Design a protein around this ligand. Structure first.
Ligand SMILES: Cc1cc2nc3c(=O)[nH]c(=O)nc-3n(C[C@H](O)[C@H](O)[C@H](O)COP(=O)(O)OP(=O)(O)OC[C@H]3O[C@@H](n4cnc5c(N)ncnc54)[C@H](O)[C@@H]3O)c2cc1C
Ligand SMILES: Cc1cc2nc3c(=O)[nH]c(=O)nc-3n(C[C@H](O)[C@H](O)[C@H](O)COP(=O)(O)OP(=O)(O)OC[C@H]3O[C@@H](n4cnc5c(N)ncnc54)[C@H](O)[C@@H]3O)c2cc1C
Lengths: 394, 394
C-alpha cells in the first residue's frame, strides 16, 4: 500500500492538509485512531482568523461556512464593572474574525473528502512510524486485526498533543518549552440564544468568565475553575449562578439559561517543541504546540502550519524542490511564538491567579486600563486578535 | 515662626514646589536634613519628560537647561545583537525627552531660590510633624542646637523614600504596594564622550546594560548586578570590560573609557502608598512612590505630583477653595499606576532574572521582537516613554 503523503490524524489539521494536497493532485492517506463519530463529538474552537477563513476557501470547503458563520467586527472586555469594546475591524485595518464551530469545520472537510473519494482509514490502531530518516519511510497500523503497511515519501504528523508523531522523534533532538496554568476552563454549550452579539471576555474577582456562541440559537460559555474540580461537581444551575455572578449586572440580567448540551473542563497549557520536524516527518497543529484558549489561536495556528507545509510540499513535488522543506520549522515558529506570547498575555490579564500579592493585582488592572484606553494599546490587542499575517516563504 | 506651606526636603520636589509656590505669592519654607553640598552630590536622573521641561519653564528656571540640555528624538534597544531605534518624536506625535542631569536641575532651583530670598533651613535636625488633622499643624526641628517651631497651614512631604512625612501618617491608614527586584544597577559617571548620541538600552544574556549621558564630554553607563555585590568590588577596568561584554560589538568598539568620577549601586524597587495624603500633610515624589530606573519616570512623576499639588494649593489659597485638596491622591495615583506599569514592563523585558525557565526566556525575547517590530507596539513604548499627558484637574 503506497501514497505520497501519509497523514496521521483526521482532525481539522490532517483533513485540511489532506484537502489542500488533493486539490493539487498530491496523493495522501489519512489515519485516524477514532471513529468519524468520536472526532465529531469534540466541541472546541469557535473563533477563526481571516487567514483560516481564506484557507478554507482555497480548499474549496467554504460554502456552509459563508452561510452560517458569523463575522464579528469587535469583541468586548469587561473588568471593574465596565465593558470596553475593541473595534477589531477599525483597529486592524479591515480584518475581522468569524465564529464558526470547529465541529462544523471538521464536518465540512469530512464531507468534501468523502465526495472526492480520497483514502481515509478510521480506527487505525497501533500507528507506528519507521525509517524517518531514510529515503523511503513507512507507517504501520492494524485495521481491525491485520497489520497493514503504508509506504510514503513524507509523513505529516497531525495527531494532536497526545499523538504518536512527536513521540517518534528522538527525545534528545527536541527542546520543549512549557507552562502549566494553575486553573482550567469549565465550558457549557446550550441551545439558548447568546447574551450578546459579540464575545465578552470578563475579568472578575471571582475568576474569568467568557460569553461566546456558535449560532443565533446556540451558546458557549466558560468560567475559570481551579484544577481540583471535577465536572460532575457542576450542575447546570451552579454554572449559571456562577456565570451570572462573574458578569456585569446589565448582562447577567438578560441571560437566557437552559440545560447543557455539553459540559467539559479544559486545563490551560502553553507548549512549544523546537524543531517541528525530523527527517521526513513534519509536525503540525497541536502535535507541535499548545496555546491556552484565551487568545483563540490554537486551531488558527494549525491552519498556518498546514498552509506552510502544503505550499512547501508543492514546491518539492511539482517543482522538484525538496531542499525547501528544511525551512518549515524556521518559518512556523516565528508565527508560533508571536501567537504564544499573545495568548499568554491575554491569559495573564484576564484570569485570577492564586498566590497574587497586592502589587501584581494592581499591575493587572492597570494593564487592562492602559491597553484598553490607549489607541495604540487597543491596536496591539486587535492586530493580534485578528491574527498576524502569514509569511510568504522563500 | 510661621509660613503658609512648610516643605520637608530640598530635593527636586521640594525645590520645584517651593519655586512654583513663590511665583504665585504663596509663602513656603523648606527644611533639609543635609547640606546644600550633600544634596548636590547625588547624580541620579538624566532623562526628563516634556511635561517636566515645561514645568521647569513655568517656574522660570529653564535658562541653563534650554542651553545645555540635549533634546533626544529617539532611544535605542539592543537585543540578540541588533539595535532597533524607537522614533519617539514620530511615534509620540511630536514629543521628545531632554537629557539634563538632576544635579543640574537641583543646582538651578537652588540658585533661583536663593536669589528670590525665600526661606530654606539646611541641616534641620529632628524634623517632626504635629497636629496633622487639626486646623493648625506645625513642624518642629533643631537648628544646630535649639528646638524651633514652625506653624503653617499645610505640609508638603518632599523628603524622599526615607523621609519622615510618610512615617508620620498612621500606618493603619495606608496601603502599601511593593516589589523588590533581585538585582541592582551599577552606575559609572565618566568625563569621556558618550558612545552614541542616543541612549542605548541593552538586553544581553550576561545582564542589562545602559549607555546614557550628561553632556557631550560626560557619560553615564549602567550594568545590571546582583544584590550580593559591593561597589568596592568593581574596579573601573572590570566595569569597562563588563560593559563592553554586554554591548553589540560595533558599539563596544568605539567606546572611549576612562576613570570614574562616581560609581554607586542602586537596587531596583517598585513602591506605591495609597493614599498620598493625611489631613494637612501631602506626600510628593519619592516620599509617596518609587519606580525602578528602567523607565526613567521617578523624577518625572515627582514633577506631576508637584504640578498637581501646586495647582490645588492655588485654588485653595487664591480662590479660597480648600475642599479641592481632597482630590490630590485620586488625581496623582492614576498617572502613578500607569507610570509604574510602564517601568515594570521595561524592567521585565530588559533584565535577566535568576530562576528563569526556558518558556519565560523565549517569551521575553518575543516581547522585544513584537513590540519592537510592530508599528502599534513601538507606539506603546514611545507614548509611555515621552510620558503620558498630565490631568487637567476639576
Ligand atoms: C476550550 C477550547 C477552546 C478552543 N478555542 C479555540 C478557538 O476559539 N480558536 C482557536 O484557534 N483554537 C481554539 N482551540 C484549539 C483547537 O481546538 C486545537 O488547536 C485544534 O483542535 C487542533 O487541531 P489538530 O488537528 O492539530 O489536532 P486535534 O484536534 O487534536 O485532532 C488530532 C487528531 O489526531 C488523532 N490521533 C491522535 N493520536 C493518534 C494516533 N496515535 N494515531 C492516529 N490518529 C491519532 C486524534 O484522534 C484527533 O482526531 C480551543 C481548544 C479548546 C479545548
Ligand atoms: C540610578 C537612578 C537613576 C534615575 N534615573 C531617573 C531618570 O533618568 N528619570 C527619572 O524621572 N527618574 C530617575 N531617577 C529617580 C529620581 O532621582 C527620584 O525619583 C528623585 O530624586 C526624587 O525626588 P524627590 O525630591 O522626591 O526626593 P529626593 O531626591 O530623595 O530628595 C528628597 C530630599 O529630602 C531630604 N530629607 C530626607 N529626610 C528628611 C527629613 N527627615 N527631614 C528633612 N529633610 C529630609 C533628603 O535629604 C533629600 O534631600 C533615578 C534614580 C536613580 C537612583
Amino acid at each position: 500500500m503506497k501514497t505520497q503523503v501519509a497523514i496521521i490524524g483526521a482532525g481539522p489539521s490532517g483533513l485540511l492538509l489532506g484537502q489542500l494536497l488533493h486539490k493539487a493532485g498530491i496523493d495522501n492517506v489519512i489515519l485516524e485512531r477514532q471513529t468519524p463519530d468520536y472526532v465529531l463529538g469534540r466541541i472546541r474552537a469557535g473563533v477563526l482568523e481571516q487567514g483560516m477563513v481564506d484557507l478554507l476557501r482555497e480548499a474549496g470547503v467554504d460554502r456552509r461556512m459563508a452561510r452560517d458563520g458569523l463575522v464579528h467586527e469587535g469583541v468586548e472586555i469587561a473588568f471593574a464593572g465596565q465593558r470596553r469594546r475593541i473595534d477589531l475591524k477599525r483597529l486592524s485595518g479591515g480584518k475581522t474574525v468569524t465564529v464558526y464551530g470547529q465541529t462544523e469545520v471538521t464536518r465540512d472537510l469530512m464531507e468534501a473528502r468523502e465526495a472526492c473519494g480520497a483514502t481515509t482509514v478510521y480506527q487505525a490502531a497501533e500507528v507506528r512510524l519507521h525509517d524517518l530518516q531514510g529515503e523511503r519511510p513507512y507507517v504501520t497500523f492494524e485495521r481491525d486485526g491485520e497489520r497493514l503497511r503504508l509506504d510514503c515519501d513524507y509523513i505529516a504528523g497531525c495527531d494532536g498533543f497526545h499523538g504518536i508523531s512527536r513521540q517518534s522523534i528522538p527525545a534528545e533532538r527536541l527542546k520543549v518549552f512549557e507552562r502549566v496554568y494553575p486553573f482550567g476552563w469549565l465550558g457549557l454549550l446550550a441551545d439558548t440564544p447568546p447574551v450578546s452579539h459579540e464575545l465578552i471576555y470578563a475579568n472578575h474577582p471571582r475568576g474569568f468568565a467568557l460569553c461566546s456562541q456558535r449560532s443565533a440559537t446556540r451558546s458557549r460559555y466558560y468560567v475559570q475553575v481551579p484544577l481540583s474540580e471535577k465536572v460532575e461537581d457542576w450542575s447546570d444551575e451552579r454554572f449559571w449562578t456562577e456565570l451570572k455572578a462573574r458578569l456585569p449586572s446589565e448582562v447577567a440580567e438578560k441571560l437566557v439559561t437552559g440545560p447543557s448540551l455539553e459540559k467539559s473542563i479544559a486545563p490551560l497549557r502553553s507548549f512549544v517543541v523546537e524543531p517541528m520536524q525530523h527527517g521526513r516527518l513534519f509536525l503540525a497543529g497541536d502535535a507541535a504546540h499548545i496555546v491556552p484558549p484565551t487568545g483563540a489561536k490554537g486551531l488558527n495556528l494549525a491552519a498556518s502550519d498546514v498552509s506552510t507545509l502544503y505550499r512547501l510540499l508543492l514546491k518539492a513535488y511539482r517543482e522538484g524542490r525538496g531542499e525547501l522543506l528544511e525551512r518549515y520549522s524556521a518559518i512556523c515558529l516565528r508565527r508560533i511564538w508571536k501567537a504564544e506570547r499573545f495568548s499568554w498575555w491575554m491569559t495573564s490579564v484576564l484570569h485570577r491567579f492564586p498566590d497574587t500579592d497586592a502589587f501584581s493585582q494592581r499591575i493587572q488592572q492597570t494593564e487592562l486600563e492602559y491597553y484598553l484606553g490607549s489607541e495604540a494599546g487597543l491596536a496591539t490587542i486587535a492586530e493580534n486578535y485578528v491574527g498576524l499575517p502569514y509569511e510568504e516563504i522563500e
